[PDB]
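Worked example 4.2. Below are the chains of a multi-component assembly; read each line carefully before continuing.
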Amino acid sequence: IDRLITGRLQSLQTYVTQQLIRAAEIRASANLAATKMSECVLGQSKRVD
Amino acid sequence: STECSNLLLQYGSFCTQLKRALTGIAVEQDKNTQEVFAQVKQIYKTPPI
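Applying the procedure described above to all two chains together yields the following structure tokens:
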């Protein structure tokens, strides 16, 4: 049971680390979408592309 | 080593998901270079003067 708990805890820690990095990746795009909603929809943008 | 490979078969899918993560990073590098540089739609060449 020591071996099984160590293996399952390592797998769950790997899952949580991957979820944290993907959460940061999603949050960056969420901030970009908030900026695009605040500038493109609520006004006229002079920024090229 | 065949005995090591038979022992590593019992340890799960860490040995494959590390390859999956590194393949994702390797795809993302080419995506980054394409996004940064491949912005123009046509290859404009300079006049000879």
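Take a moment to check your reading of the output against the notes. Helices of chain B lie at 2-8, 14-37. Chain B touches chain A at residues 11-12, 14, 17, 21, 39 (CB under 8 Å).
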